[PDB]
Amino acid sequence: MRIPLVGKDSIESKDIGFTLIHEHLRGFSEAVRQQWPHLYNEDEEFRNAVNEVKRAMQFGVKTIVDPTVMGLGRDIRFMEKVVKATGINLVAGTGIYIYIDLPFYFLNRSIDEIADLFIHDIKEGIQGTLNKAGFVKIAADEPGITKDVEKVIKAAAIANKETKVPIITHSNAHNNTGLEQQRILTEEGVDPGKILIGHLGDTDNIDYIKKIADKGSFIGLDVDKRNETTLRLIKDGYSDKIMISHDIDSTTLIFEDTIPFLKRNGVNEEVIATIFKENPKKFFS
Amino acid sequence: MRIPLVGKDSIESKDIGFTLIHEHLRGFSEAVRQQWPHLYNEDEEFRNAVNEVKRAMQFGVKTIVDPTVMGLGRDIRFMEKVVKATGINLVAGTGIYIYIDLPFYFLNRSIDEIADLFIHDIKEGIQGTLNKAGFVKIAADEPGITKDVEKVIKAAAIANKETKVPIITHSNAHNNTGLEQQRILTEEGVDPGKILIGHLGDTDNIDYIKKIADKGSFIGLDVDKRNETTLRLIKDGYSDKIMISHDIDSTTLIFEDTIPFLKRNGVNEEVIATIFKENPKKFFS
Ligand SMILES: [Co+2]
Ligand SMILES: [Co+2]
Ligand SMILES: [Fe+3]
Ligand SMILES: [Fe+3]
């Protein structure tokens, strides 16, 4: 029992099985949903989430990792309801998703105070439940590594040091934020193999992608050009660093498009198993 | 019946009486409160809010204007509870409080779409209740008039044009954001006397303040130096543009400090009546 699951007992990382490493059941701006609820329909969101999870399970998915955190409208009680309706293994996370500055709350607060929020979610539970976080999610984009973005990165490293949970990032595939995320985390003492640098499948600069993977971190490739890059990377022997996902105010695309395209281009079932079973296993090990 | 009140029938602006034009019952970051509720105690916030309203009522306050909006954690149901417990006249508002960029929701959305949210709150009601907004609140600070800040300003003007409700702003007293807010609103066709440029009491550059007032807008002076500026402005004949308030993650300061200090420096009760009764009356007229 190493990985916490929403609405279930924890499981050993070795029993995670076929895993979708980056799927959002739902996403929204906390402030907009609180202030203008007329814009949203939770019943439709629920139905859509249940349907997508069921579709994934029909293709043999055992575990889904949902990296929705602050900024994207994480709601543990919604997640519970989805689990009860499907029986899926669902890993929730903690963290903060920002591109520029932190909410006003964080004005004049230390990196340690931010880290304590993450550790609270990991050790005590999320949003007043006993459902605990199994990873930390962070982001950077076009604005680059700002002061507040760097605070969040360093907070994530502190959380990892204390709890050992892995770190997932969102980066911009065109401005080296991904490489900077990796460097800052590793300088703080994070094991590179406990980092997934995501949203890279958007670039064709395979050298940039290979550089990240070479430094020991997983690369998130989350169409023909995207599949082309994916295949390119596979044939170059980067299967064991590749993690594929689909990633608001589908899941079948992997099974209806990506994997079919791969297999009819050589890649066997041992490669598919590596990307979807072995890679997640190591990440959470 | 022109001004909407939380939990009550609307009233004529002439019956507003002694008004505190800018008091926050409660404030918080929506995203932080949703994601880490352990940080907050709503029961303590409620008790504190009730106590402050009761203190104000003991000094003869009849109406309180609470400009908490998106970004600051507006909660109409909390506001209702306070009204039920005190019997205060409470004016709620709509709008958006940002310094740099808007939530992700607003990516690729028009000024008209933003305006429609404000108009929804004014015409239909707030957060799924029949409690309607009686003004629009906007902000700018150190970053100045950004692209998204300007969007919100122009949305506020559209709302005012359609519904006639007045506009309250937060500005930085040291970078001319207040003057720019006023200019942009007036160019869009907003009557200058339907604008309150706030958070000016922080500067001693009385010429800057006088410039705003001269252009026909109310000036929000929201200690000795602050009172000094206030007195300075009063003796220069700017009483009829002055609005005073106290303005998170007291109300008596006005009655225990400011007003006492004023009166023992000449200003009579007709000036006090102008600032706290006549100025609000015109603003909402
Ligand atoms: Co992302
Ligand atoms: Co303000
Ligand atoms: Fe994502
Ligand atoms: Fe305020």
XYZ file of C-alpha atoms and ligand atoms in Angstrom:
574
model
C 0.000 0.000 0.000
C 2.076 2.888 -1.362
C -0.219 4.784 -3.760
C -3.383 6.450 -2.332
C -6.603 6.038 -4.341
C -9.738 8.177 -4.210
C -12.506 6.320 -2.380
C -10.421 3.154 -1.967
C -7.653 1.569 0.083
C -4.124 2.375 -1.086
C -2.397 -0.043 -3.470
C 1.159 -1.169 -4.179
C 2.656 0.664 -7.160
C 3.351 -2.721 -8.770
C -0.395 -3.419 -8.975
C -1.240 -0.168 -10.788
C -1.590 -1.973 -14.129
C -2.420 -0.167 -17.379
C -2.413 3.521 -16.433
C -3.501 6.767 -18.083
C -1.002 9.103 -16.467
C -2.676 12.424 -17.275
C -6.460 12.653 -17.619
C -8.662 15.450 -16.268
C -12.134 14.304 -15.202
C -13.137 17.972 -15.000
C -11.508 21.419 -15.069
C -12.632 24.985 -14.296
C -11.584 28.288 -12.706
C -12.485 28.180 -8.997
C -13.310 31.895 -8.856
C -15.506 31.929 -11.969
C -17.485 28.862 -10.892
C -18.038 30.271 -7.391
C -19.072 33.707 -8.665
C -21.123 32.714 -11.733
C -22.486 29.157 -11.189
C -25.036 29.705 -13.984
C -22.188 29.017 -16.432
C -21.754 25.407 -15.271
C -23.708 22.141 -15.191
C -22.231 19.653 -12.717
C -24.680 16.926 -13.759
C -23.433 17.084 -17.357
C -19.807 17.183 -16.178
C -20.447 14.095 -14.045
C -22.144 12.168 -16.865
C -19.298 13.074 -19.232
C -16.631 12.041 -16.707
C -18.330 8.714 -15.943
C -18.710 7.951 -19.660
C -15.042 8.685 -20.419
C -13.815 6.537 -17.516
C -16.069 3.668 -18.618
C -14.764 3.954 -22.196
C -11.186 3.796 -20.898
C -11.978 0.759 -18.745
C -13.421 -0.976 -21.823
C -9.991 -0.580 -23.452
C -8.374 -2.167 -20.389
C -7.373 0.901 -18.348
C -7.028 -0.015 -14.661
C -5.789 3.255 -13.133
C -6.304 6.910 -14.049
C -4.101 9.750 -12.783
C -6.004 13.047 -12.601
C -3.622 16.034 -12.121
C -6.324 18.650 -11.490
C -5.094 20.989 -8.728
C -5.578 24.569 -7.489
C -6.146 26.786 -10.522
C -7.950 24.014 -12.427
C -10.787 23.369 -9.960
C -9.827 20.161 -8.125
C -12.900 18.729 -6.377
C -12.304 15.546 -4.382
C -16.021 14.961 -3.748
C -16.734 15.001 -7.494
C -13.860 12.548 -7.930
C -15.316 10.257 -5.242
C -18.677 10.211 -7.016
C -16.989 9.182 -10.273
C -15.132 6.344 -8.543
C -18.310 5.055 -6.878
C -20.009 5.030 -10.287
C -17.201 3.267 -12.193
C -14.909 1.402 -9.767
C -11.817 2.941 -11.411
C -8.549 3.335 -9.518
C -8.081 7.119 -9.391
C -4.968 8.918 -8.159
C -5.573 12.512 -7.041
C -2.778 15.036 -6.567
C -1.905 18.349 -4.944
C -0.016 21.409 -6.154
C -0.676 24.773 -7.787
C -1.245 25.663 -11.434
C -0.149 29.220 -12.268
C 1.608 30.931 -15.187
C 2.462 34.306 -13.610
C 1.521 35.167 -10.020
C -0.021 33.410 -7.018
C -3.409 34.369 -5.472
C -3.347 37.317 -3.054
C -3.433 34.858 -0.137
C 0.219 33.998 -0.786
C 1.498 37.579 -0.548
C 4.322 37.552 2.010
C 4.248 33.781 2.517
C 7.275 31.488 2.437
C 8.055 28.550 0.164
C 7.769 26.416 3.313
C 4.187 27.592 3.901
C 3.287 26.614 0.336
C 5.015 23.248 0.787
C 3.014 22.662 3.987
C -0.234 22.850 1.994
C 1.003 20.099 -0.335
C 2.209 17.981 2.591
C -1.181 18.471 4.278
C -2.905 16.988 1.210
C -0.410 14.115 1.028
C -0.328 13.171 4.721
C -3.712 14.245 6.138
C -6.035 14.342 3.121
C -7.686 16.552 0.496
C -10.368 19.180 1.142
C -11.341 17.747 4.534
C -11.546 14.111 3.391
C -9.259 11.148 4.066
C -8.460 10.927 0.343
C -4.739 11.683 0.128
C -2.620 13.091 -2.710
C -0.188 10.757 -4.475
C 1.803 13.349 -6.462
C 2.435 17.082 -6.838
C 1.403 18.979 -10.068
C 3.120 22.383 -11.088
C 3.114 24.530 -14.215
C 4.948 27.136 -16.255
C 4.145 28.555 -19.686
C 4.783 31.517 -21.988
C 5.695 33.985 -19.169
C 8.540 31.627 -18.219
C 9.963 30.993 -14.746
C 8.580 33.933 -12.760
C 9.275 34.586 -9.075
C 6.014 32.926 -8.002
C 6.417 30.062 -10.489
C 9.836 29.349 -8.948
C 8.345 29.421 -5.439
C 5.879 26.688 -6.411
C 8.623 24.595 -8.021
C 10.754 24.750 -4.869
C 7.720 23.984 -2.686
C 7.122 20.870 -4.800
C 10.708 19.737 -4.148
C 10.246 20.179 -0.387
C 7.060 18.090 -0.536
C 8.848 15.354 -2.505
C 11.756 15.334 -0.043
C 9.392 14.804 2.892
C 6.852 12.406 1.365
C 8.672 10.935 -1.646
C 5.666 11.464 -3.944
C 6.602 12.189 -7.608
C 6.163 15.479 -9.468
C 4.257 16.146 -12.686
C 4.737 19.405 -14.596
C 3.054 21.333 -17.369
C 5.503 23.239 -19.574
C 5.504 25.232 -22.808
C 7.087 23.150 -25.558
C 8.647 26.222 -27.180
C 10.517 28.157 -24.469
C 12.606 25.736 -22.394
C 10.413 26.030 -19.283
C 10.445 22.223 -19.116
C 14.238 22.014 -18.973
C 14.316 24.773 -16.337
C 11.705 22.978 -14.220
C 13.832 19.830 -14.326
C 17.053 21.681 -13.457
C 15.547 23.571 -10.510
C 13.946 20.429 -9.063
C 17.132 18.362 -9.452
C 19.291 21.096 -7.878
C 16.943 20.972 -4.871
C 17.652 17.238 -4.616
C 14.701 15.674 -6.459
C 15.536 12.376 -8.175
C 15.142 13.072 -11.943
C 13.237 9.797 -12.387
C 10.576 11.191 -10.048
C 9.757 13.983 -12.506
C 7.445 13.977 -15.515
C 7.944 16.996 -17.776
C 4.694 17.305 -19.698
C 3.109 18.988 -22.715
C 6.154 18.340 -24.909
C 4.288 16.571 -27.723
C 3.533 20.072 -29.025
C 7.074 20.598 -30.328
C 8.966 18.855 -33.134
C 12.371 19.748 -31.681
C 13.085 16.135 -30.735
C 16.552 17.182 -29.550
C 14.991 19.323 -26.807
C 12.758 16.415 -25.769
C 15.630 13.908 -25.877
C 17.708 16.264 -23.734
C 15.123 16.152 -20.936
C 14.762 12.366 -21.163
C 18.548 11.928 -21.237
C 18.768 13.761 -17.902
C 16.631 10.955 -16.481
C 13.094 12.409 -16.425
C 9.932 11.102 -18.083
C 8.644 13.051 -21.076
C 4.923 13.671 -21.497
C 3.784 13.535 -25.120
C 0.401 15.009 -24.203
C -1.693 14.349 -34.588
C 0.351 12.633 -37.307
C 3.217 14.972 -36.404
C 2.663 14.215 -32.714
C 2.453 10.495 -33.490
C 5.427 10.959 -35.819
C 7.491 12.437 -32.983
C 6.235 9.664 -30.696
C 7.243 6.993 -33.215
C 10.530 8.779 -33.921
C 11.326 8.728 -30.195
C 10.278 5.084 -29.858
C 12.493 3.910 -32.713
C 15.386 5.862 -31.164
C 14.962 3.875 -27.940
C 13.204 6.398 -25.686
C 10.212 4.148 -24.951
C 11.244 3.829 -21.297
C 10.903 7.589 -20.750
C 7.750 8.139 -22.808
C 4.408 8.729 -21.139
C 1.369 9.323 -23.328
C -1.936 10.935 -22.389
C -4.746 13.002 -23.916
C -4.806 15.623 -21.156
C -12.643 22.566 -19.297
C -14.077 26.092 -19.238
C -10.949 12.249 -25.707
C -9.635 9.237 -23.778
C -10.381 6.978 -26.749
C -8.125 9.048 -29.020
C -5.250 7.031 -27.547
C -6.904 3.715 -28.412
C -8.695 4.774 -31.603
C -5.823 6.762 -33.125
C -2.431 6.785 -31.415
C -1.905 3.135 -30.451
C -3.425 1.792 -33.727
C -1.118 4.105 -35.694
C 1.892 2.961 -33.659
C 1.269 -0.779 -33.965
C 0.805 -0.673 -37.744
C 4.225 1.004 -37.912
C 6.155 -1.778 -36.173
C 5.994 -1.038 -32.441
C 4.945 -4.282 -30.741
C 2.862 -4.876 -27.607
C 5.951 -4.921 -25.377
C 6.547 -1.252 -26.200
C 2.898 -0.419 -25.490
C 3.217 -2.219 -22.155
C 6.353 -0.223 -21.325
C 4.746 3.168 -21.947
C 1.445 2.423 -20.200
C 2.417 -0.069 -17.489
C 6.142 -0.127 -16.741
C 6.759 3.630 -16.959
C 3.923 4.518 -14.496
C 5.059 1.685 -12.215
C 8.588 3.102 -11.931
C 7.329 6.679 -11.608
C 5.248 5.772 -8.547
C 7.691 3.168 -7.203
C -37.112 51.255 -5.032
C -33.872 51.897 -6.926
C -31.100 50.317 -4.821
C -31.166 46.507 -4.270
C -30.438 45.264 -0.735
C -29.280 41.813 0.345
C -32.153 39.924 1.970
C -34.535 42.893 1.739
C -36.797 44.814 -0.621
C -35.061 47.504 -2.677
C -35.046 51.078 -1.359
C -35.031 54.575 -2.838
C -31.528 56.062 -2.920
C -32.847 59.033 -0.927
C -33.599 56.744 2.032
C -30.084 55.265 2.210
C -29.185 57.435 5.215
C -25.757 57.355 6.873
C -23.698 55.039 4.662
C -20.321 53.311 4.910
C -19.449 53.214 1.230
C -16.646 50.642 1.346
C -16.630 47.912 3.998
C -15.719 44.258 3.438
C -17.629 41.831 5.668
C -15.183 39.120 4.583
C -12.451 38.568 1.980
C -10.479 35.566 0.688
C -9.030 33.920 -2.431
C -11.703 31.656 -3.951
C -9.165 29.078 -5.142
C -7.262 28.850 -1.849
C -10.432 28.498 0.228
C -11.820 25.800 -2.084
C -8.553 23.847 -2.179
C -7.417 24.233 1.450
C -10.523 24.823 3.644
C -8.495 23.928 6.759
C -7.059 27.461 6.582
C -10.437 29.115 7.224
C -13.077 29.330 9.958
C -16.416 30.583 8.625
C -17.955 30.662 12.109
C -15.286 33.104 13.310
C -15.642 35.176 10.127
C -19.404 35.342 10.690
C -19.082 36.356 14.353
C -16.535 39.030 13.416
C -18.723 40.381 10.598
C -21.843 40.509 12.785
C -19.933 42.288 15.565
C -18.513 44.932 13.207
C -21.917 45.634 11.638
C -23.500 45.956 15.090
C -20.744 48.365 16.181
C -21.373 50.482 13.077
C -25.127 50.501 13.708
C -24.465 51.717 17.264
C -22.730 54.751 15.730
C -25.792 55.378 13.552
C -24.824 53.617 10.305
C -27.946 52.690 8.318
C -26.460 51.229 5.122
C -23.221 49.382 4.370
C -21.776 48.964 0.869
C -19.680 45.796 0.570
C -17.579 45.785 -2.657
C -16.365 42.181 -2.377
C -16.393 40.640 -5.874
C -14.660 37.889 -7.878
C -11.050 37.691 -6.708
C -11.975 38.651 -3.132
C -14.399 35.804 -2.377
C -17.885 37.335 -2.665
C -20.423 35.042 -0.976
C -24.035 36.222 -1.124
C -25.268 33.521 1.274
C -22.784 34.656 3.935
C -23.993 38.215 3.351
C -27.629 37.125 3.782
C -26.806 35.486 7.111
C -25.190 38.709 8.344
C -28.244 40.752 7.347
C -30.632 38.345 9.091
C -28.523 38.643 12.249
C -28.242 42.457 12.263
C -31.010 44.006 10.129
C -28.461 46.211 8.318
C -29.120 47.550 4.827
C -26.391 45.889 2.741
C -25.591 46.688 -0.887
C -23.779 43.896 -2.745
C -21.969 44.429 -6.039
C -20.553 42.635 -9.065
C -17.308 42.984 -10.999
C -13.813 41.502 -11.102
C -10.760 42.262 -8.976
C -7.486 41.607 -10.820
C -4.088 43.318 -11.057
C -2.597 41.500 -14.071
C -4.484 38.761 -15.928
C -7.950 37.193 -15.863
C -8.635 33.530 -14.914
C -8.104 30.975 -17.695
C -11.878 30.871 -18.248
C -11.700 34.275 -19.945
C -9.111 33.261 -22.552
C -10.571 34.194 -25.946
C -13.679 35.853 -24.505
C -14.994 39.282 -25.472
C -15.530 42.382 -23.349
C -19.244 41.860 -24.048
C -19.143 38.373 -22.504
C -17.545 39.815 -19.367
C -20.135 42.608 -19.289
C -22.925 40.013 -19.555
C -21.773 38.434 -16.279
C -22.088 41.797 -14.514
C -25.488 42.459 -16.096
C -26.611 38.972 -15.019
C -25.801 39.848 -11.391
C -27.526 43.232 -11.681
C -30.699 42.123 -13.480
C -31.213 38.463 -12.510
C -29.342 38.065 -9.216
C -26.122 36.896 -7.551
C -24.909 33.294 -7.299
C -28.343 31.800 -7.991
C -30.252 34.033 -5.554
C -32.642 36.927 -6.166
C -30.210 39.293 -4.420
C -29.136 41.721 -7.143
C -25.978 43.817 -7.538
C -26.246 47.587 -7.097
C -22.809 48.599 -8.435
C -19.762 47.309 -10.313
C -16.301 47.025 -8.570
C -12.950 46.986 -10.655
C -9.271 47.277 -9.777
C -5.804 48.191 -10.984
C -2.533 48.411 -9.064
C 1.251 48.384 -9.471
C 1.246 46.519 -12.846
C -0.831 49.386 -14.266
C -3.493 49.198 -16.980
C -2.823 45.785 -18.530
C -4.760 44.306 -21.454
C -7.029 42.295 -19.139
C -7.405 45.177 -16.669
C -8.619 47.354 -19.561
C -11.085 44.655 -20.647
C -12.677 44.693 -17.188
C -12.844 48.498 -17.158
C -14.640 48.565 -20.514
C -16.980 45.763 -19.406
C -17.892 47.874 -16.367
C -18.797 50.788 -18.661
C -21.058 48.538 -20.754
C -22.808 47.350 -17.582
C -23.299 50.947 -16.408
C -24.679 51.981 -19.805
C -27.287 49.211 -19.696
C -28.268 49.271 -16.012
C -27.127 52.707 -14.814
C -25.495 51.266 -11.674
C -22.398 53.219 -10.480
C -18.782 52.037 -10.566
C -16.317 51.742 -7.691
C -12.597 51.272 -8.353
C -9.487 50.290 -6.454
C -6.358 52.089 -7.666
C -2.719 52.513 -6.662
C -2.226 55.972 -5.183
C 1.274 56.259 -6.659
C 1.049 55.418 -10.378
C -1.909 57.261 -11.920
C -4.016 54.112 -12.399
C -6.909 56.020 -10.813
C -6.774 58.836 -13.362
C -6.527 56.294 -16.197
C -9.532 54.360 -14.874
C -11.547 57.583 -14.837
C -10.453 58.597 -18.348
C -11.211 55.203 -19.909
C -14.648 55.000 -18.271
C -15.573 58.568 -19.266
C -14.417 58.035 -22.870
C -16.774 55.035 -22.996
C -19.605 57.361 -21.951
C -19.804 56.833 -18.178
C -20.973 59.909 -16.258
C -17.963 60.950 -14.092
C -20.251 61.441 -11.080
C -21.079 57.731 -11.282
C -17.463 56.796 -10.538
C -15.671 56.456 -7.210
C -11.888 56.280 -7.571
C -10.695 54.606 -4.389
C -7.590 53.932 -2.304
C -6.275 57.475 -2.780
C -5.860 58.281 0.922
C -2.498 56.510 0.628
C -0.875 59.413 -1.232
C -0.066 62.950 -0.081
C -0.048 64.329 -3.630
C -3.255 66.287 -3.049
C -2.938 67.752 -6.552
C -3.380 64.280 -8.067
C -6.434 63.679 -5.868
C -7.903 67.118 -6.619
C -7.415 66.465 -10.333
C -9.646 63.379 -10.182
C -12.298 65.165 -8.110
C -12.185 68.192 -10.424
C -13.072 65.916 -13.351
C -16.299 65.161 -11.486
C -15.631 61.801 -9.784
C -15.790 60.904 -6.093
C -12.476 60.300 -4.340
C -12.115 57.449 -1.861
C -9.887 58.308 1.094
C -9.770 54.666 2.178
C -3.460 58.125 9.981
C -2.673 61.720 10.966
C -1.281 62.208 7.455
C -4.380 60.540 6.002
C -6.598 62.648 8.266
C -4.386 65.627 7.419
C -5.010 65.106 3.700
C -8.707 64.589 4.446
C -8.859 67.829 6.442
C -6.744 69.630 3.839
C -9.214 68.569 1.138
C -12.212 69.527 3.279
C -10.920 73.029 3.986
C -10.244 73.447 0.252
C -13.915 72.715 -0.464
C -13.769 69.122 -1.731
C -16.213 67.762 0.864
C -18.807 67.045 -1.834
C -16.461 64.616 -3.610
C -14.990 62.949 -0.521
C -16.023 59.454 0.489
C -14.420 57.906 3.558
C -14.210 54.241 4.515
C -11.953 51.806 6.381
C -11.904 49.178 3.627
C -8.876 39.042 4.713
C -6.482 36.152 4.067
C -11.924 48.459 11.953
C -15.295 50.106 11.284
C -15.018 52.053 14.543
C -11.743 53.656 13.426
C -13.921 56.136 11.526
C -15.930 57.020 14.634
C -13.184 56.594 17.240
C -10.413 58.353 15.306
C -11.206 60.056 12.004
C -14.472 61.887 12.718
C -13.397 62.934 16.268
C -10.146 64.311 14.830
C -12.050 66.190 12.117
C -14.641 67.795 14.392
C -12.062 69.094 16.876
C -10.376 70.807 13.916
C -13.388 72.871 12.840
C -15.381 70.701 10.427
C -19.005 70.841 11.590
C -21.765 68.220 11.422
C -22.989 69.504 8.049
C -19.690 68.421 6.487
C -19.930 65.006 8.158
C -23.464 64.672 6.793
C -22.247 65.566 3.296
C -19.510 62.925 3.227
C -21.568 60.111 4.762
C -25.120 60.891 3.631
C -25.290 63.309 0.706
C -22.333 61.925 -1.265
C -23.632 58.291 -1.196
C -27.128 59.558 -2.032
C -25.926 61.282 -5.213
C -23.656 58.376 -6.155
C -26.595 55.951 -6.142
C -29.157 58.474 -7.412
Co -0.975 20.869 -18.610
Co -9.398 48.140 -2.800
Fe -3.454 18.555 -18.088
Fe -11.693 47.283 -0.398
